[PDB]
């Protein structure tokens, strides 16, 4: 035997398509482990999930377990340097993150495959001897505060906390999870609490081996991973902590039959219907809640949504089970509301109960369960191979819920038909346990309560007993019918033999006035799936704001019109994406290849013969007005990015321009625009997956023929295939553009140091520099100086040009943010001077692994080719070519590049800053800056600068 292993599990059931090898075990201290050997992986990975979270915070220190989560990265006894962990990962092509929910704290990393043991050693110390350094703790509490600030004016986070504030206030469910500076520092100081001791006591008490699950994925054999994991994790102490459990529901009698009226930040209108239910987790082999969700949440003919949509009351619906914690769950039905829907909330909820009554009338349906079982089995068999980092993290969470042997299958395979469970859940969906929440600006100034942590304005009322009664007597409405058999369920999974003429990259197999067709038969994944991507080029999609509006509205009305039919295809693993672009339209069809030509045909046919329903048109136009308006409530950093895009691209219509133009979109006008849009087009496509050349040629010509037949499409002239250019900033110039975010009380900044056109050498100069400064920028600007939670640095690529950008969101003013980025850039010039040759070669090597990391699934490989196609660079072998050149670079080359393009006194510095002010508006030495040119009018700024050329094709 082995003293350190309690048991090794039996065979871990996996998909027969899965070439990874697996071994489950439990250590003697109680840690549940999954080991995954993949000898092909470029990045290895591990995750650890401790089954404690938020719901176990001390009642007097809200946010503690989330604070501990941040603090664990900031040093341990064996590795006391504050960023030893992140720096180690950065220098070895790795990355890490963590999250805290009510019951789990989950930590994960990935790393270059040769450096697993080093990464994993440093990571294991988190669970053995964190330092919770006093100085780290006082700085890091600012990152958490700033994380909560970002969430404060977000509607989803406000609704999430509001639900917890209106159940039983004594129940742990009512806790505030994120915490902030108030809860984590200010108030504890006032109460004589030593937060460092609290972190140490909480870690001591709950970070117990018996509550942990570990997953490790590496090239090493299963035996080697076994020894590694025993070596590192055997020392975690078992304190035998009982798993926390919450058998009493946070919504008791007095919390039921309540109506909440809520003021949102965005102009949104929604209706939330909720019923408390028991915890159904233990019934995973039948999944009664999924069965009900699938039915109540259906979007096919005869569905609930379908009738609410025809009445013109709602556009969208989500229904089904929602997680609570060990011992309680919820079942939801939530919809968005049209203006007319807002006035018929009562009738909407009755239709919900009529639909529920139809399910009780028909009884549990074994054929529905069989369909669900069959799709889940196909989905599991042909699951795309996952990136290691998300895969270890996700399995760590679920090791707490399923036997070792079933961890891979348990969320997929259904085994038991349980009409008794289906009826038992359905018996809880009754008007006597209903909670109803309406979100709308119409409640402004009509509310009388305020939620503490977010400020949310709402009113609570009992639902009148006569309203409950009307709902309890709901009868059968003849518009509601069970869905019928889903005929998109695929049954042909044959993998076509690899053709003799198959190539490693996409090949241009059709090059005509109408269409350019890039094609590759999958030679790696061997799943019965394909991706079909199309750019439709037309100047009329973006010629003015009005047209761009009409392009959008057309495509939204089209998707709305197809929804009923397309929903079945997407339950059957066949989906599509359709949107207007600054060039035209983009269409992508992905998933099982079997029925895929059927759905594609249908989209092109509808596209080309579309008849707008006038009612759908007014509803979708009003949602779009709101959606443009609601931009004002996005975050300051999203504003800054959005303004830079408008500043640097040749053509770009603002949200304001689109909004003004929107009133002039009439039905007549939209009906005229469509044939005009479709009259002349160019189509560039990538057809990639389980498909032959001649099926690819056939699919392409079928799209052409359908357009030609129905919309009389002719080819665009080559000269009209315009790409837009980037604005060319002058040597030594600095421009600032300044605006205010009217909603958030944080500011945001984007700083862009433009370099030159993209090419091999320029790319790798910028990428290597970015790789070098990446971790230090986060360490400096966030961990040390604490300027904000959101601190970002990296390449910016647009319209064939590039440069270095910095994005920060902070309470500090933008001019101060600027000076800190500038101090930091100097700090980096010195680090680069002082770093060893070997330190320098480790960064080359890390960038190299990053760039050469193999796609693990079809759609990631398609996305690489697609980026070559849409950028018109067509450099399909870029990665080998760029990396060969990268390996040639020296320290001097990067110092010279920095001195020429980036330094404060650089001869070719080209800087633009976007300053977004907050609603209401020791340290290294910042250099003196010149006086900037303040941009007053974006159109004038553009007209007075040159425009770069466009990049040439391979």
Interacting residue ranges for Zn ion, rule: CB under 5 A: 147
Nearest CA to 65 out of 122, 103, 30 is that of: 103
Rounded to the nearest whole angstrom, what is the least distance from the CB of residue 279 to Zn ion in the complex?
27
Q: What share of the chain is helix, strand, coil (3-state, %, to 5)?
A: 45, 20, 35
By Cβ distance, which residue is nearest to Zn ion? 147
Distance CA 710, CA 714 (A): 12
Distance CA 576, CA 654 (A): 28
Rounded to the nearest whole angstrom, what is the least distance from the CB of residue 107 to Zn ion in the complex?
12
Query: Which C-beta is closer to Zn ion: that of 152 or that of 368?
Result: 152
Say which residues have a Cβ less than 8 Å from residue 816's Cβ, sequence separation at least 6. none
C-beta pairs of 877-883 under 8 Å, 24+ apart in sequence:
877/505, 879/851, 879/852, 880/852, 881/760, 882/760, 882/763, 882/764, 882/851, 883/847, 883/848, 883/851, 883/852
Which string of DSSP letters, residue by residue, matches 65-106? HHHHHHHGGG-BSSS-STTHHHHHHHTTT-EEEEEE-SS-EE
Query: Which C-beta is closer to Zn ion: that of 147 or that of 868?
Result: 147
What tokens does 160 get?
A: 């999430």
SS3 state of residue 134: helix
Query: Which C-beta is closer to Zn ion: that of 147 or that of 726?
Result: 147
Rounded to the nearest whole angstrom, what is the least distance from the CB of residue 399 to Zn ion in the complex?
23
Rounded to the nearest whole angstrom, what is the least distance from the CB of residue 177 to Zn ion in the complex?
10
Query: Which C-beta is closer to Zn ion: that of 147 or that of 535?
Result: 147
Rounded to the nearest whole angstrom, what is the least distance from the CB of residue 73 to Zn ion in the complex?
11
Ramachandran quadrant class, 357 (left: phi over 0; alpha: psi -120 to 50; beta: rest): alpha
Query: Which C-beta is closer to Zn ion: that of 147 or that of 220?
Result: 147
- In Å, the largest CA–CA distance within the chain is 81
Rounded to the nearest whole angstrom, what is the least distance from the CB of residue 153 to Zn ion in the complex?
18
Query: Which C-beta is closer to Zn ion: that of 63 or that of 320?
Result: 63
Map tokens 């695929």 to a residue.
490
Query: Which C-beta is closer to Zn ion: that of 147 or that of 785?
Result: 147
Rounded to the nearest whole angstrom, what is the least distance from the CB of residue 700 to Zn ion in the complex?
47
Rounded to the nearest whole angstrom, what is the least distance from the CB of residue 98 to Zn ion in the complex?
8
Rounded to the nearest whole angstrom, what is the least distance from the CB of residue 106 to Zn ion in the complex?
12
Ramachandran quadrant class, 862 (left: phi over 0; alpha: psi -120 to 50; beta: rest): alpha
Query: Which C-beta is closer to Zn ion: that of 147 or that of 704?
Result: 147
What tokens does 424 get?
A: 């038992």
What tokens does 663 get?
A: 């009133």
Other C-beta atoms closer than 10 Å to the C-beta of 282 total 8
Rounded to the nearest whole angstrom, what is the least distance from the CB of residue 66 to Zn ion in the complex?
6
Query: Which C-beta is closer to Zn ion: that of 782 or that of 856?
Result: 782
C-alpha dihedral over 366, 371, 377, 380, to 10 degrees?
Answer: -130
Distance CA 241, CA 229 (A): 22
Rounded to the nearest whole angstrom, what is the least distance from the CB of residue 86 to Zn ion in the complex?
15
Distance CA 559, CA 60 (A): 50
Distance CA 927, CA 583 (A): 42
878-886 and 837-852 helices cross at what angle (nearest 10)? 180
Structural element, H or E, at residue 762: helix 760-778
Distance CA 638, CA 626 (A): 18
Query: Which C-beta is closer to Zn ion: that of 184 or that of 749?
Result: 184
Rounded to the nearest whole angstrom, what is the least distance from the CB of residue 136 to Zn ion in the complex?
15
Query: Which C-beta is closer to Zn ion: that of 75 or that of 218?
Result: 75
Rounded to the nearest whole angstrom, what is the least distance from the CB of residue 144 to Zn ion in the complex?
6
Query: Which C-beta is closer to Zn ion: that of 66 or that of 843?
Result: 66
Nearest CA to 433 out of 614, 603, 276 is that of: 276
Distance CA 158, CA 743 (A): 14
Say which residues have a Cβ less than 8 Å from residue 598's Cβ, sequence separation at least 6. 488
Output the 3-class SS for 924-942.
Answer: CCCCCCCCCEECCCHHHHH
Query: Which C-beta is closer to Zn ion: that of 105 or that of 593?
Result: 105
Query: Which C-beta is closer to Zn ion: that of 184 or that of 640?
Result: 184
Q: CA angle at residue 99 from 95 to 104, to 5 degrees?
A: 130
Map tokens 């100047």 to a residue.
539
Q: How many CA atoms lie within 13 A of 553 on its CB side?
A: 35
Query: Which C-beta is closer to Zn ion: that of 160 or that of 505?
Result: 160
Strands 791-798 and 747-757: unpaired
Rounded to the nearest whole angstrom, what is the least distance from the CB of residue 789 to Zn ion in the complex?
8
Rounded to the nearest whole angstrom, what is the least distance from the CB of residue 148 to Zn ion in the complex?
9
What tokens does 895 get?
A: 């110092």
Distance CA 20, CA 857 (A): 14
Query: Which C-beta is closer to Zn ion: that of 47 or that of 229?
Result: 47
CA 832 to centroid of chain Cα atoms: 34
Rounded to the nearest whole angstrom, what is the least distance from the CB of residue 67 to Zn ion in the complex?
8
């Amino acid at each position: 035997n082995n003293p350190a292993i309690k048991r090794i599990g039996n065979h871990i059931t996996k998909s027969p398509e899965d070439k990874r090898e697996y071994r489950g075990l439990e250590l003697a201290n109680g840690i549940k482990v999954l080991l995954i050997s993949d000898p092909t992986t470029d990045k290895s990975s591990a995750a650890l999930d401790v089954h404690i979270g938020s719901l176990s915070d001390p009642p007097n220190i809200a946010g503690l377990s989330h604070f501990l989560q941040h603090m664990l990265f900031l040093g341990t006894k064996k590795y006391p340097k504050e960023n030893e962990y992140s720096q180690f990962l950065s220098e070895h092509a790795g990355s890490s993150n963590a999250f805290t929910s009510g019951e789990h704290t989950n930590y994960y990393f990935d790393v270059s495959h040769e450096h697993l043991e080093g990464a994993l050693d440093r990571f294991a110390q988190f669970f053995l001897s964190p330092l919770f350094d006093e100085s780290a703790k006082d700085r890091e509490v600012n990152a958490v505060d700033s994380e909560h600030e970002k969430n404060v004016m977000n509607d989803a986070w406000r609704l999430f906390q509001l639900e917890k504030a209106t159940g039983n206030p004594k129940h742990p469910f009512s806790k505030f999870g994120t915490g902030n500076k108030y809860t984590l520092e200010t108030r504890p100081n006032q109460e004589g609490i030593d937060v460092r001791q609290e972190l140490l006591k909480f870690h001591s008490a709950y970070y117990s081996s018996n509550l942990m699950a570990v997953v490790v994925l590496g090239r090493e054999s299963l035996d080697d991973l076994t020894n590694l994991v025993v070596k590192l994790f055997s020392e975690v102490e078992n304190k035998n902590v009982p798993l926390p459990e919450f058998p009493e529901h946070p919504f008791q009698e007095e919390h039921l039959k309540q109506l909440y009226k809520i003021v949102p930040i965005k102009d949104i209108r929604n209706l939330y219907v909720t019923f408390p239910i028991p915890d159904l987790q233990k019934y995973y082999k039948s999944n009664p809640g999924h069965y009900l969700g699938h039915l109540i949440g259906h979007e096919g003919p005869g569905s609930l949504l379908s009738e609410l949509k025809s009445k013109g009351w709602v556009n969208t619906l989500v229904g089904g089970q929602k997680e609570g914690a060990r011992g309680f769950m919820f079942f939801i039905i939530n919809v968005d509301l049209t203006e007319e829907g807002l006035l018929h909330v009562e009738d909407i909820i009755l239709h919900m109960f009529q639909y529920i009554q139809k399910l009780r009338a028909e009884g549990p349906q074994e054929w529905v369960f069989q369909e669900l079982k069959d799709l889940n089995a196909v989905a599991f068999r042909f699951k795309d191979k996952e990136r290691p980092r998300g895969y270890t993290s996700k399995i760590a969470g679920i090791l707490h819920y399923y036997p070792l042997e079933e961890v891979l299958t348990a969320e997929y395979l259904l085994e038991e038909f349980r009409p008794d469970l289906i009826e038992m859940v359905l018996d809880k969906l009754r008007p006597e346990n209903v909670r109803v929440a309406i979100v709308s600006k119409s409640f402004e100034g009509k509310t009388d309560r305020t939620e503490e942590w977010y400020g949310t304005q709402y009113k609570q009322e009992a639902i009148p007993d006569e309203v409950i009664k009307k709902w309890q007597n709901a009868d059968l409405n003849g518009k509601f019918k069970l869905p019928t058999k889903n005929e998109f369920i695929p049954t042909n999974f044959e993998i076509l033999p690899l053709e003799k003429e198959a190539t490693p990259y996409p090949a241009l197999i059709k090059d005509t006035a109408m269409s350019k067709l890039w094609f590759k038969q999958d030679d790696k994944f061997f799943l019965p799936k394909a991706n079909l991507n199309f750019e439709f080029f037309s100047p009329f999609a973006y010629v003015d704001p009005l047209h761009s509006n009409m392009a959008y509205l057309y495509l939204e009305l089209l998707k709305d019109s197809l929804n009923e039919y397309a929903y079945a295809a997407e339950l059957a693993g066949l989906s599509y994406d359709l949107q207007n672009t600054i060039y035209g339209m983009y269409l992508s069809v992905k998933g099982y290849n079997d029925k895929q030509p059927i759905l594609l045909k249908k989209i092109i046919e509808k596209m080309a013969t579309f008849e707008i329903d006038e009612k759908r048109f007014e509803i979708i136009k009003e949602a779009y007005m709101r959606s443009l308006n609601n931009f004002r409530a996005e975050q300051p950093h999203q504003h800054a990015m959005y303004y830079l895009r408008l500043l640097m691209t040749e053509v770009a219509w603002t949200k304001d321009e689109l909004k003004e133009a929107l009133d002039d979109v009439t039905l007549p006008r939209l009906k005229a625009f469509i044939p005009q849009l479709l009259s002349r087009l160019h189509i560039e496509a990538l057809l990639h997956g389980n498909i032959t050349k001649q099926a690819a040629l056939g699919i392409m010509q079928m799209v052409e023929d359908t357009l030609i037949e129905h919309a009389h499409t002719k080819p665009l002239l080559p000269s009209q295939l315009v790409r837009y250019r980037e604005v060319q900033l002058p040597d030594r110039g600095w421009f600032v553009y300044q605006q205010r975010n009217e909603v958030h009380n944080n500011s945001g900044i984007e700083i862009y140091y433009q370099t030159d056109m993209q090419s091999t050498s320029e790319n790798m100069f910028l990428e290597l520099f970015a790789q070098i400064i990446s971790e230090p920028a986060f360490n400096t600007l966030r961990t040390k100086e604490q300027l904000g939670y959101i601190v970002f640095s990296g390449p910016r690529r647009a319209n064939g040009i590039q440069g270095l950008r910095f994005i920060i969101q902070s309470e500090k003013p933008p001019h101060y943010l600027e000076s800190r980025v500038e101090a930091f850039l100097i700090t980096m010039e010195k680090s680069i001077e002082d770093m060893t040759e070997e330190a320098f070669q480790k960064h080359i090597q890390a960038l190299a692994i990053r760039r050469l990391d193999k796609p693990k699934k079809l759609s990631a490989e398609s996305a690489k080719y697609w980026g070559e196609i849409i950028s018109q660079q067509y450099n399909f072998d870029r990665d080998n070519t760029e990396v060969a050149y990268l390996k040639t670079l020296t320290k001097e080359d990067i110092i010279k590049f920095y001195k020429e393009m980036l330094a404060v006194d650089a001869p070719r510095r080209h800087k633009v800053s976007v300053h977004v002010l907050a609603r209401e508006m020791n340290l290294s030495q910042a250099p003196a800056l010149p006086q900037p040119e303040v941009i007053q009018n974006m159109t004038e700024f553009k007209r007075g600068l040159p425009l770069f050329p466009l990049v040439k094709p391979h």
